[PDB]
Design a protein around this ligand. Sequence first.
Ligand SMILES: NC(=O)C1=CN([C@@H]2O[C@H](COP(=O)(O)OP(=O)(O)OC[C@H]3O[C@@H](n4cnc5c(N)ncnc54)[C@H](OP(=O)(O)O)[C@@H]3O)[C@@H](O)[C@H]2O)C=CC1
Ligand SMILES: NC(=O)C1=CN([C@@H]2O[C@H](COP(=O)(O)OP(=O)(O)OC[C@H]3O[C@@H](n4cnc5c(N)ncnc54)[C@H](OP(=O)(O)O)[C@@H]3O)[C@@H](O)[C@H]2O)C=CC1
Lengths: 307, 309
Amino acid sequence: SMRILVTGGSGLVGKAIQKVVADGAGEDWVFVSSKDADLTDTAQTRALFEKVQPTHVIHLAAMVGGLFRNIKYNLDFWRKNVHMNDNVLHSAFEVGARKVVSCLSTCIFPDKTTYPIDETMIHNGPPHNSNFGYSYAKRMIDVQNRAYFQQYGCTFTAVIPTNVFGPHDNFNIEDGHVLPGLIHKVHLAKSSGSALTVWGTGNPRRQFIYSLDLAQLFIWVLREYNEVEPIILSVGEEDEVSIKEAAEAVVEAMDFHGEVTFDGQFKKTASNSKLRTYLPDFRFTPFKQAVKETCAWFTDNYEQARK
Amino acid sequence: SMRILVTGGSGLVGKAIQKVVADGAGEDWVFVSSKDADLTDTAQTRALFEKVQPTHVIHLAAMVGGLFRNIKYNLDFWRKNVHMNDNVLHSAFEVGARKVVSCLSTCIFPDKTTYPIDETMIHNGPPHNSNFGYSYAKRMIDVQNRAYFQQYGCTFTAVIPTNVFGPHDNFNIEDGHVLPGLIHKVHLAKSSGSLTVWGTGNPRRQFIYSLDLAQLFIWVLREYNEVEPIILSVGEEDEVSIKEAAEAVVEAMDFHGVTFDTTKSDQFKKTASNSKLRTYLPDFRFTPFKQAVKETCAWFTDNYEQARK
Ligand SMILES: NC(=O)C1=CN([C@@H]2O[C@H](COP(=O)(O)OP(=O)(O)OC[C@H]3O[C@@H](n4cnc5c(N)ncnc54)[C@H](OP(=O)(O)O)[C@@H]3O)[C@@H](O)[C@H]2O)C=CC1
Ligand SMILES: NC(=O)C1=CN([C@@H]2O[C@H](COP(=O)(O)OP(=O)(O)OC[C@H]3O[C@@H](n4cnc5c(N)ncnc54)[C@H](OP(=O)(O)O)[C@@H]3O)[C@@H](O)[C@H]2O)C=CC1
């Protein structure tokens, strides 16, 4: 008998976890996504934890977005995220939560670094200075986790997904998630003429993880896995696709037949061999099928979707 | 014209700034803190800042002490310090403060590094794991300064003193501040038969006398407008071994009874570069090490009862 509290249950990763149907199955699952509780307010946050009395917490909530927009607000990404993370982790502690699993991103790793990055390298140099406020707030999560563990022996971890995509993503072209950016562009291009890309070489490579797959692995991390050192959740370091190959998959999936044309990292390779030490028999949804499914979702949910 | 708020005004560094008398002078120096306001509390911190309406802030206050003890509290050191820093920096942001200067110690720098360290190396690798909590919280002040600058154009900064000593230090032997602990050990020595000190005596350290530091702080507040921090330290050409620090203290206090106790702690170097201060202040001169020790030994004996021991 456990009650799982999911912060940011209404975003890309949260909506994916809300299935779970099929079925998660045991567990009382509580999804929150708010207001309902502004995790930036300590009063509202402790109140939220006092009401529901989580035994387990999956922490997805974060101040994100604008993040890939060129005008930066590094004080805001820093202050807002640090408050939320402290509020959430420490409220969890105070009501006696047994486990908290938070979420970091690969873009917070040292800008320098040799590839592939692994879970031990997160603090080994300063992040890229673009979004340093966001990057250091996320890094501090690992720092909080290790502190809780040192002083009270609590088990609080984090997962490190690569680039997540899927239904309920941010499809707003301006704020720059590249995959859902592509889906939206192709959709605009069909009902007009010519069109593409999201501009650039198309050469840069990313590891993409389908939100539905991430949801599976996240429920496993919650149920099992008790390191405090984070775990990279991602497809193999040889299953990256270039942006060009991502556009080719979207164009294929949406049956777009117009012109493409082109004119960032250029790679952030992450190893998933810790994951492979635990789950060697787990298989990711093929990229092309995952793209095709999130394309179909976009077209059948155009009115409801984020931009 | 210029109202100046100093948190941690009752600490070693703060007490030294309160002179000034001597004479700083234009100004208006508001020495507070003393947890007459608990800087851990957003409400009280705000109220204090709304009450006094500073244009400048020397943020000295921090959660230290117990820091060098054997049993570690990284969660507390992290949370409390992060809260203080945020509270202070942002409350000062909200009252429209023209400038903020904070303090980092060299403790927080990467455990694995080349020497000498300079201002651009603070984030180049993880601090020693003993006190990661305190170390990362200090580092985040730098992150915080850059954020106010980038997003608002404000000039918040930090100075990085090497090992500060002087009047009003923590002379407690368990809170193992090396130099105050020597001074205090020699005193419990004379007041009986015979040391210690702990370790081999070989490790080298850069010490700065509080009153030297007080005068650079004032300057940094008045001049200095970079968000990149500034190391406040004597040169690398200087630097004294723990043995030489014990000797100077032995002389100063006329002790005649030593031994080292191979067994205890011991990095063996934390060498910081002062190039940037030497560029701004080529003619500034520190008080000599031997005199400064004597002067603080004297203050210690003259103020025993009312000292942190
Ligand atoms: N998407 C990606 O590519 C990657 C994401 N991650 C991490 O995964 C997590 C999930 O991201 P994702 O699902 O993509 O993000 P989304 O932006 O899609 O979802 C954001 C969630 O955060 C919540 N939230 C934001 N601000 C607050 C607040 N003040 N109080 C309460 N809730 C708030 C939102 O709730 P509301 O709707 O109520 O605003 C929403 O549920 C994030 O923490 C992210 O950093 C990690 C690696 C890659
Ligand atoms: N060698 C050194 O000593 C070095 C120090 N530094 C940094 O420089 C600063 C100077 O430290 P120093 O003066 O030596 O240390 P002290 O311990 O003497 O000073 C502590 C000061 O902080 C105040 N304080 C502590 N907790 C709180 C709180 N919750 N609210 C308000 N005030 C609080 C204390 O006030 P009260 O008396 O009321 O508790 C006291 O005024 C420190 O921040 C340190 O990190 C950097 C490099 C070297």
